[PDB]
Amino acid sequence: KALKLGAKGKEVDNFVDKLKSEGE
Amino acid sequence: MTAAENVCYTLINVPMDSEPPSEISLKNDLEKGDVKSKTEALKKVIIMILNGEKLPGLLMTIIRFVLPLQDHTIKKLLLVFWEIVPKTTPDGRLLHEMILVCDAYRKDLQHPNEFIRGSTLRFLCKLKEAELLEPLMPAIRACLEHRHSYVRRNAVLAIYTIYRNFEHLIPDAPELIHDFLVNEKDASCKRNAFMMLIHADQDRALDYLSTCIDQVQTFGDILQLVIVELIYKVCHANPSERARFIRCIYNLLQSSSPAVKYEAAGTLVTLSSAPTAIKAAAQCYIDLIIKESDNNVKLIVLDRLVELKEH
Amino acid sequence: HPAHERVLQDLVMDILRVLSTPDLEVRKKTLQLALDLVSSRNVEELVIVLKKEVIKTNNVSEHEDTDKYRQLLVRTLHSCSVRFPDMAANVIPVLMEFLSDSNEAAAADVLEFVREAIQRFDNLRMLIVEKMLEVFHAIKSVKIYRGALWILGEYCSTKEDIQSVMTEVRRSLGEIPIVESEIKKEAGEEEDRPPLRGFLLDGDFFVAASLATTLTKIALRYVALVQEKKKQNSFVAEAMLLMATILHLGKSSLPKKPITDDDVDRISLCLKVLSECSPLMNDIFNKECRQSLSQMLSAKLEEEKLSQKKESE
Amino acid sequence: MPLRLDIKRKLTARSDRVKSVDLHPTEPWMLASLYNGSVCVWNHETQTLVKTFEVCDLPVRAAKFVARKNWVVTGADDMQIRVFNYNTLERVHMFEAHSDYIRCIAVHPTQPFILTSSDDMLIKLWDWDKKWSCSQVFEGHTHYVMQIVINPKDNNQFASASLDRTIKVWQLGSSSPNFTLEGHEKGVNCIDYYSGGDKPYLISGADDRLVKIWDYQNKTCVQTLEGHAQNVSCASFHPELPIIITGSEDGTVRIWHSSTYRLESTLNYGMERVWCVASLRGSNNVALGYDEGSIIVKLGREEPAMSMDANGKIIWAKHSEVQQANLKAMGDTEIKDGERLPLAVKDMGSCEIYPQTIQHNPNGRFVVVCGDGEYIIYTAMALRNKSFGSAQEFAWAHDSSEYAIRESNSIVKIFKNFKEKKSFKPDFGAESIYGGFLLGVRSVNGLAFYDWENTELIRRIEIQPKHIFWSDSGELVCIATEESFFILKYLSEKVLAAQETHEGVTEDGIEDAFEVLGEIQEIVKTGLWVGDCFIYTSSVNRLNYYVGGEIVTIAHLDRTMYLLGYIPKDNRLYLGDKELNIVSYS
Amino acid sequence: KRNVTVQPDDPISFMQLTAKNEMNCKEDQFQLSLLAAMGNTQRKEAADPLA
């Protein structure tokens, strides 16, 4: 029940979500 | 074709310091010499032919007295000799003497020495005479199942070049190499099989990649580079596939190999025009320029940032 | 690509980090790329970084290409100040300190910039004249000294500035009459020769022809600014005395090379103009010379636009 | 008192026998000369072999960087000096220097001079601006000259160590030694100068297994260090730390305190015999050469022991001396951004312990100095000792009257008004403690926040913090890690409500106690809150502040700077460097 | 040199109808670079292939 910080792959997901926000 | 219009795989500019050996001297050394004298005579013959001398009188002497030798150096020198020697008449017909040489290639493809098999398979990639390849096809196919990775990797390259030049000799080559790629464990053999599929059958290369796409980050740098090349070619031909591969290319920007990072950044720019994708590729180039100590890398990667700016 | 240019404009400060490379060609390409990406948004940060790099070149004496890099930075700051005139006020004082540099090529590029800026930007004239008077005594190159004399002669508009120019010219000549002073010095009645007296004794009288033109321009302007005839006549006679003492030096055996007949004709012309003080000569020296500079600068700008337009057309 | 040096391995380079090591002044490079005739350049940041020079088939006993010329100078057993450009790998020059083996090369710091020592009993001076002409020969040793070192305080003087059992001090321009030091029973293998201005000391190591410290003004042996089991091959003073480093053929490196001469640490890395040591001025990195390779060790913290009070009084430690500067004493001087401030420094006296950390209490009345496993609390005005004790770590509370000490990995003690208030054991142990509004305790499993009054658990966080910074309001907290930092909001009202109602209290504390506002992929070196803005220095030498999810860069720093504080009256942020240069930014 | 005179039969580009993400299909630069390196690139401009 410890607070988990950092999920692996979040940087790639953030990049993909930015690209989607730019219309890709 | 003149020797100047012919495909040239080898250039040797040795100053012929000593009196150019007479064809009669070379013939005597090839017939009666020891293995060392035959080796030196064969080297001289190769250099003379490469420098534009026509020695048709020596062909049968080499076939009779040099071809049956089991010396490894002579075997390799003979592959260079068969690369450069005219195999056809002026009218484009195969020389009758070449039938005797074809049986020697078949024996060398079945040789107990794995390096002789591999070197012979590499030589067969340069052969343009379909009539010489046709009787060798069963022995070339058997080399795909060889226990040594050195034979298997060169057998894939031989099959690729035969399929590219003479599809009718091996019409099942893309399927045979796909089944080879799925079962292979050696990284060099996998790369060569995947490289063939990129050029011969992109759909089978994509099917294989689709099974492994989540594991591409764990592959060796050589296989990653060839995967990036496939993704580039496929997305260039079919822009709808870009959406599938962007995630894979972005993961390759974090590769440990600087060569893979460079190619992944270059490919990412071709997959996406989105500001975030261009920013990620540009940051990868800037990081390569800062981290790489070699000025050649710095200048060439700077030119990629200049090309990006032109848009 | 015009679509990508705006994205690269945001990265100009990162591109400028490449100036840490000691190679001159890398620095040259980087400065050219940065200059081409300059916008109203980044010009201020760019000028601050380029000023810091210019100041660093004074402290780092060790690299062979430091002088060439300094010249490149000066040209880059010039081009920025021409495109963004609001930055010129901040750039000019720092660039004018390089007029005292031993590198004649860097000082020449600064002088050409200062000449263009003082003509285009009327608000900078006072600042440029004041700074030029401060650095004037430190100028080592004859060519730079001649160009500084011309700027002071053309743009000094106040009575105080004209008197300050005359004072610095006298200080740079030393004791007058020059021939009598040098004979007394030889009689005992690099010897830190005032720079202008050094140049004249080395036989460089083309500087004296430019000085005569400068003295003529300032004397005619002083006559228009000052109502007291006695002060007008004293200042004109003082300017004529400086020309006459230089002509006497140039004809003497004292300089390493005698004055040329062309320089004698030019100084003699200026003496004659000051003796007659005709309204035609005043209009030629104080209006037509400045109009000719303005026409030359506009012509250069039209040819650059025409060349760019021929490439675009 | 035992100097608690945190010794971290930065590089491990396995190779053939290393005979010399050197550190590049600007690049992260270690030069290693090998017994097989090769010279290797290692990058200690990337842990990679960057460059290799094949010099000859014979041992290379000496190699040095000449950074100003981009050169590596090598001396091999072939009697040849070879000069290589380390960028092009080209051999710039080669000449026969001596008639026997070259043992040591010393490069003059400012002049175009190289000193070489040889088994020919000679020392030679070479001038590279004069086409490598031999400018002088120093004769007077009667056996092999094993090492030479230039005096860092007077570059016209150098010392030589010889197997003749003597140390000679020479002057450039004199064919005769200024004096000879005698007292080793066997050949002297190594020599070094004390770099600090306070002491005229030389150190020497010999085959007698002794290290001797000499006063070169009085020509007397000050101290003898005993404890090596074999020949002493290298001895050096550390340029920044108050330590002596000695290496021996016994395979051990010994670290000694330079003032007390006590053995502090013994390092054995299992690389057989030690042959050479190199240190760099302004760096805590030490290179060690062995039979089986080379190692770089980082000694201690690189952060200077400095603190600023809310009134602009800066206290720092320069070694054992505590100095005070006052920002108010500068007057109306025009301060420019990123320029060094001309501060009047006042000596406050020497500390009894080596100060690793100095911190003011929140109200600036007291200063804690922590070092050697002790803490001493002084009065900030007059450095009067007010409290002392043993602690591994010290943390001030937000209340200027409260502090916590970590006595061990399992016991934390809280003090109020310099008296012990409470002692408790955290459930998972205590690896570090953090001050502020809540007592932060780092364990192997993560971070726990405790109430200063009750020692009740408020919240557990699954993170390994490096630093914790609280805002002055107590509403915001920055948790900085080794890779990223997190901004959290502390919901004090929800914590109070949960303590009264017992709702939402779990074994991991109050669930609603903290809200995550942001995560930033930047490494925080130092940080400070000003209102709701978090100001920090990054690993990339940027001065940034975080506000509302935005990172704003204040300045690009040309060197590693450490945040001291912000003075609202002056609208200025103050930073210090490793050299105790104070800079300010608007 | 880039301002080709727009002909009456040239396509009208409606930017409002074009999807924002249409990257212009650049020619395969790898294949062009390989052909150029082999010397098999006919120079586009000067050798009219019908000469």
mmCIF file with all atom_site columns, N, CA and C in Angstrom, chain D residues 50-88:
data_model
loop_
_atom_site.group_PDB
_atom_site.id
_atom_site.type_symbol
_atom_site.label_atom_id
_atom_site.label_alt_id
_atom_site.label_comp_id
_atom_site.label_asym_id
_atom_site.label_entity_id
_atom_site.label_seq_id
_atom_site.pdbx_PDB_ins_code
_atom_site.Cartn_x
_atom_site.Cartn_y
_atom_site.Cartn_z
_atom_site.occupancy
_atom_site.B_iso_or_equiv
_atom_site.pdbx_formal_charge
_atom_site.auth_seq_id
_atom_site.auth_comp_id
_atom_site.auth_asym_id
_atom_site.auth_atom_id
_atom_site.pdbx_PDB_model_num
ATOM 1   N N  . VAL D 1 50 ? 38.922 5.726  -23.664 1.00 0.00 ? 50 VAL D N  1
ATOM 2   C CA . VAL D 1 50 ? 38.737 6.725  -24.722 1.00 0.00 ? 50 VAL D CA 1
ATOM 3   C C  . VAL D 1 50 ? 39.880 6.691  -25.724 1.00 0.00 ? 50 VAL D C  1
ATOM 4   N N  . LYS D 1 51 ? 41.120 6.618  -25.239 1.00 0.00 ? 51 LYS D N  1
ATOM 5   C CA . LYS D 1 51 ? 42.313 6.680  -26.081 1.00 0.00 ? 51 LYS D CA 1
ATOM 6   C C  . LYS D 1 51 ? 43.358 5.687  -25.598 1.00 0.00 ? 51 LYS D C  1
ATOM 7   N N  . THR D 1 52 ? 44.114 5.142  -26.536 1.00 0.00 ? 52 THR D N  1
ATOM 8   C CA . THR D 1 52 ? 45.243 4.261  -26.245 1.00 0.00 ? 52 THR D CA 1
ATOM 9   C C  . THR D 1 52 ? 46.405 4.678  -27.124 1.00 0.00 ? 52 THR D C  1
ATOM 10  N N  . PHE D 1 53 ? 47.557 4.896  -26.520 1.00 0.00 ? 53 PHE D N  1
ATOM 11  C CA . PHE D 1 53 ? 48.812 5.168  -27.193 1.00 0.00 ? 53 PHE D CA 1
ATOM 12  C C  . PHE D 1 53 ? 49.702 3.945  -27.019 1.00 0.00 ? 53 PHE D C  1
ATOM 13  N N  . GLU D 1 54 ? 50.098 3.335  -28.116 1.00 0.00 ? 54 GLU D N  1
ATOM 14  C CA . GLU D 1 54 ? 51.150 2.326  -28.100 1.00 0.00 ? 54 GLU D CA 1
ATOM 15  C C  . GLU D 1 54 ? 52.483 3.045  -28.234 1.00 0.00 ? 54 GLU D C  1
ATOM 16  N N  . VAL D 1 55 ? 53.209 3.113  -27.131 1.00 0.00 ? 55 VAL D N  1
ATOM 17  C CA . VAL D 1 55 ? 54.440 3.887  -27.053 1.00 0.00 ? 55 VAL D CA 1
ATOM 18  C C  . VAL D 1 55 ? 55.613 3.036  -27.517 1.00 0.00 ? 55 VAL D C  1
ATOM 19  N N  . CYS D 1 56 ? 55.827 1.907  -26.874 1.00 0.00 ? 56 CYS D N  1
ATOM 20  C CA . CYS D 1 56 ? 56.890 0.954  -27.179 1.00 0.00 ? 56 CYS D CA 1
ATOM 21  C C  . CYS D 1 56 ? 56.584 -0.409 -26.537 1.00 0.00 ? 56 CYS D C  1
ATOM 22  N N  . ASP D 1 57 ? 57.431 -1.403 -26.777 1.00 0.00 ? 57 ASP D N  1
ATOM 23  C CA . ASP D 1 57 ? 57.298 -2.732 -26.161 1.00 0.00 ? 57 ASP D CA 1
ATOM 24  C C  . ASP D 1 57 ? 57.817 -2.792 -24.711 1.00 0.00 ? 57 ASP D C  1
ATOM 25  N N  . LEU D 1 58 ? 58.387 -1.692 -24.230 1.00 0.00 ? 58 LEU D N  1
ATOM 26  C CA . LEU D 1 58 ? 59.023 -1.593 -22.925 1.00 0.00 ? 58 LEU D CA 1
ATOM 27  C C  . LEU D 1 58 ? 58.140 -0.796 -21.956 1.00 0.00 ? 58 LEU D C  1
ATOM 28  N N  . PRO D 1 59 ? 58.302 -0.984 -20.640 1.00 0.00 ? 59 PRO D N  1
ATOM 29  C CA . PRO D 1 59 ? 57.493 -0.286 -19.650 1.00 0.00 ? 59 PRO D CA 1
ATOM 30  C C  . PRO D 1 59 ? 57.519 1.232  -19.804 1.00 0.00 ? 59 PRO D C  1
ATOM 31  N N  . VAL D 1 60 ? 56.342 1.848  -19.765 1.00 0.00 ? 60 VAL D N  1
ATOM 32  C CA . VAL D 1 60 ? 56.197 3.301  -19.652 1.00 0.00 ? 60 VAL D CA 1
ATOM 33  C C  . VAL D 1 60 ? 55.999 3.637  -18.180 1.00 0.00 ? 60 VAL D C  1
ATOM 34  N N  . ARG D 1 61 ? 57.033 4.190  -17.543 1.00 0.00 ? 61 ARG D N  1
ATOM 35  C CA . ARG D 1 61 ? 57.022 4.464  -16.098 1.00 0.00 ? 61 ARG D CA 1
ATOM 36  C C  . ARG D 1 61 ? 56.442 5.818  -15.743 1.00 0.00 ? 61 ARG D C  1
ATOM 37  N N  . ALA D 1 62 ? 56.470 6.752  -16.665 1.00 0.00 ? 62 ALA D N  1
ATOM 38  C CA . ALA D 1 62 ? 55.980 8.100  -16.459 1.00 0.00 ? 62 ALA D CA 1
ATOM 39  C C  . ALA D 1 62 ? 55.133 8.553  -17.646 1.00 0.00 ? 62 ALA D C  1
ATOM 40  N N  . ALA D 1 63 ? 53.974 9.129  -17.357 1.00 0.00 ? 63 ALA D N  1
ATOM 41  C CA . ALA D 1 63 ? 53.152 9.823  -18.329 1.00 0.00 ? 63 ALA D CA 1
ATOM 42  C C  . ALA D 1 63 ? 52.414 10.979 -17.645 1.00 0.00 ? 63 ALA D C  1
ATOM 43  N N  . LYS D 1 64 ? 52.320 12.113 -18.343 1.00 0.00 ? 64 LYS D N  1
ATOM 44  C CA . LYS D 1 64 ? 51.692 13.336 -17.837 1.00 0.00 ? 64 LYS D CA 1
ATOM 45  C C  . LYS D 1 64 ? 50.886 14.019 -18.930 1.00 0.00 ? 64 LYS D C  1
ATOM 46  N N  . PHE D 1 65 ? 49.763 14.619 -18.544 1.00 0.00 ? 65 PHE D N  1
ATOM 47  C CA . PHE D 1 65 ? 49.053 15.537 -19.420 1.00 0.00 ? 65 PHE D CA 1
ATOM 48  C C  . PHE D 1 65 ? 49.737 16.905 -19.452 1.00 0.00 ? 65 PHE D C  1
ATOM 49  N N  . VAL D 1 66 ? 49.804 17.490 -20.635 1.00 0.00 ? 66 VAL D N  1
ATOM 50  C CA . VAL D 1 66 ? 50.103 18.907 -20.851 1.00 0.00 ? 66 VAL D CA 1
ATOM 51  C C  . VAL D 1 66 ? 48.872 19.526 -21.501 1.00 0.00 ? 66 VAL D C  1
ATOM 52  N N  . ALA D 1 67 ? 47.861 19.815 -20.685 1.00 0.00 ? 67 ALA D N  1
ATOM 53  C CA . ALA D 1 67 ? 46.539 20.218 -21.159 1.00 0.00 ? 67 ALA D CA 1
ATOM 54  C C  . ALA D 1 67 ? 46.574 21.455 -22.070 1.00 0.00 ? 67 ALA D C  1
ATOM 55  N N  . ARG D 1 68 ? 47.382 22.453 -21.724 1.00 0.00 ? 68 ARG D N  1
ATOM 56  C CA . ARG D 1 68 ? 47.562 23.696 -22.496 1.00 0.00 ? 68 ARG D CA 1
ATOM 57  C C  . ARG D 1 68 ? 48.047 23.515 -23.936 1.00 0.00 ? 68 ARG D C  1
ATOM 58  N N  . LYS D 1 69 ? 48.684 22.401 -24.237 1.00 0.00 ? 69 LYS D N  1
ATOM 59  C CA . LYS D 1 69 ? 49.194 22.059 -25.573 1.00 0.00 ? 69 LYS D CA 1
ATOM 60  C C  . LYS D 1 69 ? 48.465 20.870 -26.209 1.00 0.00 ? 69 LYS D C  1
ATOM 61  N N  . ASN D 1 70 ? 47.453 20.333 -25.550 1.00 0.00 ? 70 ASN D N  1
ATOM 62  C CA . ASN D 1 70 ? 46.766 19.103 -25.953 1.00 0.00 ? 70 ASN D CA 1
ATOM 63  C C  . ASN D 1 70 ? 47.714 17.891 -26.071 1.00 0.00 ? 70 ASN D C  1
ATOM 64  N N  . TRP D 1 71 ? 48.714 17.815 -25.211 1.00 0.00 ? 71 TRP D N  1
ATOM 65  C CA . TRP D 1 71 ? 49.725 16.772 -25.271 1.00 0.00 ? 71 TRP D CA 1
ATOM 66  C C  . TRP D 1 71 ? 49.633 15.772 -24.120 1.00 0.00 ? 71 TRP D C  1
ATOM 67  N N  . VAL D 1 72 ? 50.079 14.567 -24.424 1.00 0.00 ? 72 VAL D N  1
ATOM 68  C CA . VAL D 1 72 ? 50.500 13.571 -23.442 1.00 0.00 ? 72 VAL D CA 1
ATOM 69  C C  . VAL D 1 72 ? 51.999 13.376 -23.609 1.00 0.00 ? 72 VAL D C  1
ATOM 70  N N  . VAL D 1 73 ? 52.751 13.591 -22.550 1.00 0.00 ? 73 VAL D N  1
ATOM 71  C CA . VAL D 1 73 ? 54.195 13.350 -22.514 1.00 0.00 ? 73 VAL D CA 1
ATOM 72  C C  . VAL D 1 73 ? 54.442 12.028 -21.807 1.00 0.00 ? 73 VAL D C  1
ATOM 73  N N  . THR D 1 74 ? 55.203 11.149 -22.435 1.00 0.00 ? 74 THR D N  1
ATOM 74  C CA . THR D 1 74 ? 55.513 9.815  -21.918 1.00 0.00 ? 74 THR D CA 1
ATOM 75  C C  . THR D 1 74 ? 57.015 9.618  -21.791 1.00 0.00 ? 74 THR D C  1
ATOM 76  N N  . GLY D 1 75 ? 57.445 8.931  -20.749 1.00 0.00 ? 75 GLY D N  1
ATOM 77  C CA . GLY D 1 75 ? 58.817 8.490  -20.554 1.00 0.00 ? 75 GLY D CA 1
ATOM 78  C C  . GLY D 1 75 ? 58.855 6.977  -20.362 1.00 0.00 ? 75 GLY D C  1
ATOM 79  N N  . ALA D 1 76 ? 59.553 6.300  -21.247 1.00 0.00 ? 76 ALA D N  1
ATOM 80  C CA . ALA D 1 76 ? 59.626 4.848  -21.271 1.00 0.00 ? 76 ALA D CA 1
ATOM 81  C C  . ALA D 1 76 ? 61.022 4.334  -20.907 1.00 0.00 ? 76 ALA D C  1
ATOM 82  N N  . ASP D 1 77 ? 61.107 3.037  -20.649 1.00 0.00 ? 77 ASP D N  1
ATOM 83  C CA . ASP D 1 77 ? 62.367 2.383  -20.328 1.00 0.00 ? 77 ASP D CA 1
ATOM 84  C C  . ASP D 1 77 ? 63.331 2.324  -21.534 1.00 0.00 ? 77 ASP D C  1
ATOM 85  N N  . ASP D 1 78 ? 62.870 2.639  -22.734 1.00 0.00 ? 78 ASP D N  1
ATOM 86  C CA . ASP D 1 78 ? 63.712 2.800  -23.928 1.00 0.00 ? 78 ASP D CA 1
ATOM 87  C C  . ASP D 1 78 ? 64.515 4.116  -23.938 1.00 0.00 ? 78 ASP D C  1
ATOM 88  N N  . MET D 1 79 ? 64.491 4.860  -22.837 1.00 0.00 ? 79 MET D N  1
ATOM 89  C CA . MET D 1 79 ? 65.167 6.154  -22.644 1.00 0.00 ? 79 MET D CA 1
ATOM 90  C C  . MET D 1 79 ? 64.602 7.293  -23.496 1.00 0.00 ? 79 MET D C  1
ATOM 91  N N  . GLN D 1 80 ? 63.499 7.049  -24.182 1.00 0.00 ? 80 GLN D N  1
ATOM 92  C CA . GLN D 1 80 ? 62.864 8.017  -25.055 1.00 0.00 ? 80 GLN D CA 1
ATOM 93  C C  . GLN D 1 80 ? 61.731 8.744  -24.326 1.00 0.00 ? 80 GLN D C  1
ATOM 94  N N  . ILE D 1 81 ? 61.694 10.050 -24.503 1.00 0.00 ? 81 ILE D N  1
ATOM 95  C CA . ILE D 1 81 ? 60.490 10.835 -24.264 1.00 0.00 ? 81 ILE D CA 1
ATOM 96  C C  . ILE D 1 81 ? 59.737 10.958 -25.578 1.00 0.00 ? 81 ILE D C  1
ATOM 97  N N  . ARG D 1 82 ? 58.449 10.665 -25.535 1.00 0.00 ? 82 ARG D N  1
ATOM 98  C CA . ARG D 1 82 ? 57.538 10.804 -26.669 1.00 0.00 ? 82 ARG D CA 1
ATOM 99  C C  . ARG D 1 82 ? 56.389 11.717 -26.281 1.00 0.00 ? 82 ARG D C  1
ATOM 100 N N  . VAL D 1 83 ? 56.083 12.638 -27.157 1.00 0.00 ? 83 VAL D N  1
ATOM 101 C CA . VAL D 1 83 ? 55.004 13.602 -26.989 1.00 0.00 ? 83 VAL D CA 1
ATOM 102 C C  . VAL D 1 83 ? 53.939 13.287 -28.022 1.00 0.00 ? 83 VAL D C  1
ATOM 103 N N  . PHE D 1 84 ? 52.720 13.067 -27.569 1.00 0.00 ? 84 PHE D N  1
ATOM 104 C CA . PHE D 1 84 ? 51.572 12.769 -28.412 1.00 0.00 ? 84 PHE D CA 1
ATOM 105 C C  . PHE D 1 84 ? 50.532 13.873 -28.291 1.00 0.00 ? 84 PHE D C  1
ATOM 106 N N  . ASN D 1 85 ? 49.914 14.237 -29.413 1.00 0.00 ? 85 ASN D N  1
ATOM 107 C CA . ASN D 1 85 ? 48.684 15.009 -29.379 1.00 0.00 ? 85 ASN D CA 1
ATOM 108 C C  . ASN D 1 85 ? 47.530 14.056 -29.026 1.00 0.00 ? 85 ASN D C  1
ATOM 109 N N  . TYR D 1 86 ? 46.845 14.293 -27.918 1.00 0.00 ? 86 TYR D N  1
ATOM 110 C CA . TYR D 1 86 ? 45.776 13.387 -27.488 1.00 0.00 ? 86 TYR D CA 1
ATOM 111 C C  . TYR D 1 86 ? 44.486 13.516 -28.307 1.00 0.00 ? 86 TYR D C  1
ATOM 112 N N  . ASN D 1 87 ? 44.332 14.554 -29.123 1.00 0.00 ? 87 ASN D N  1
ATOM 113 C CA . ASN D 1 87 ? 43.180 14.712 -30.008 1.00 0.00 ? 87 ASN D CA 1
ATOM 114 C C  . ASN D 1 87 ? 43.376 13.958 -31.326 1.00 0.00 ? 87 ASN D C  1
ATOM 115 N N  . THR D 1 88 ? 44.532 14.123 -31.947 1.00 0.00 ? 88 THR D N  1
ATOM 116 C CA . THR D 1 88 ? 44.845 13.491 -33.237 1.00 0.00 ? 88 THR D CA 1
ATOM 117 C C  . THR D 1 88 ? 45.531 12.136 -33.102 1.00 0.00 ? 88 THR D C  1
#
